[PDB]
Amino acid sequence: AAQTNAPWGLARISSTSPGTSTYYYDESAGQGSCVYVIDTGIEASHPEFEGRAQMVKTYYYSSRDGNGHGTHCAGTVGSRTYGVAKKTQLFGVKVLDDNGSGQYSTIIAGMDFVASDKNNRNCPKGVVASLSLGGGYSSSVNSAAARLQSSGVMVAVAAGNNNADARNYSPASEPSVCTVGASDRYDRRSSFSNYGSVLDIFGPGTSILSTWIGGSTRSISGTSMATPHVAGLAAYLMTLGKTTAASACRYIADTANKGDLSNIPFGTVNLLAYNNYQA
């Protein structure tokens, strides 16, 4: 398939070069795979989701995304126009309130919920998790990301929007999950994007156009906008049968666009997420 006039982030994961605006992908599009979005919630009634999105857990008075952050990220994973895996199943886990904040224990409880709830869902192509959140370092927020990875779910986490080493931030500093940086349309590291030897891949994170609450759309920047690119890509890659949850982050970094990004600090990986699709 080929989506014309797609967002630049989608075309860039199907392009060996920047400056294009066409997204190419196998027509499978993550049919049979599942991606949990552990954020502020997903507006499941958005027409862009085509009834493929639904809220499975909340830790507050409502599972409604009164923020819009989780709705944007879910639209980048698998919506029809702004999504990578346009046929996946989207599950919402609201661990952050409508201000985008939440207690570490609420986040830890959400990661444990996904490692069990995947046995309540039908995902014959595997389970993906996108954690577009983060705070300071915590060995207990790290160990729970590793538990979610060990259960059988690919865990993709934002590197952080601090312009620093992601070693002082969780769960970005967990070595078994997949730490994702951000880039812009000119193949440069986002001025806010974190770096370090813990990063495993870079995704489109600057000026990302996706769904928004109220049935609307908007463009926002952040490493939390490049994680759903990799989370959706893996669901796409697992549906084709190229890789598994445990080896997705190693496969994505093996088929990536090597050495194309500028302003990558020394010792940080220069790899851009690439779907390797040949039409």
UniProtKB/Swiss-Prot annotation:
Disulfide bonds join 34-123, 178-249. Ca(2+) 1 binds at residues 175, 177, 200. It catalyses: Hydrolysis of keratin, and of other proteins with subtilisin-like specificity. Hydrolyzes peptide amides. Keywords: Calcium, Disulfide bond, Hydrolase, Metal-binding, Protease, Serine protease, Signal, Zymogen. Ca(2+) 2 binds at residues 16, 260. Its cofactor is Ca(2+). Its EC number is 3.4.21.64. GO terms for cellular component: extracellular region. One of its GO terms (biological process) is proteolysis. Residues 7-279 form the Peptidase S8 domain. GO terms for molecular function: metal ion binding; serine-type endopeptidase activity. It is an enzyme of class 3 (hydrolase). The active site is at 39 (charge relay system), 69 (charge relay system), 224 (charge relay system). Binds 2 calcium ions per subunit. Belongs to the peptidase S8 family. Hydrolyzes keratin at aromatic and hydrophobic residues. This is Proteinase K. It comes from Parengyodontium album (Tritirachium album). The lineage of its organism: Eukaryota, Fungi, Dikarya, Ascomycota, Pezizomycotina. The chain holds residues 106 to 384 of 384 of the full protein.
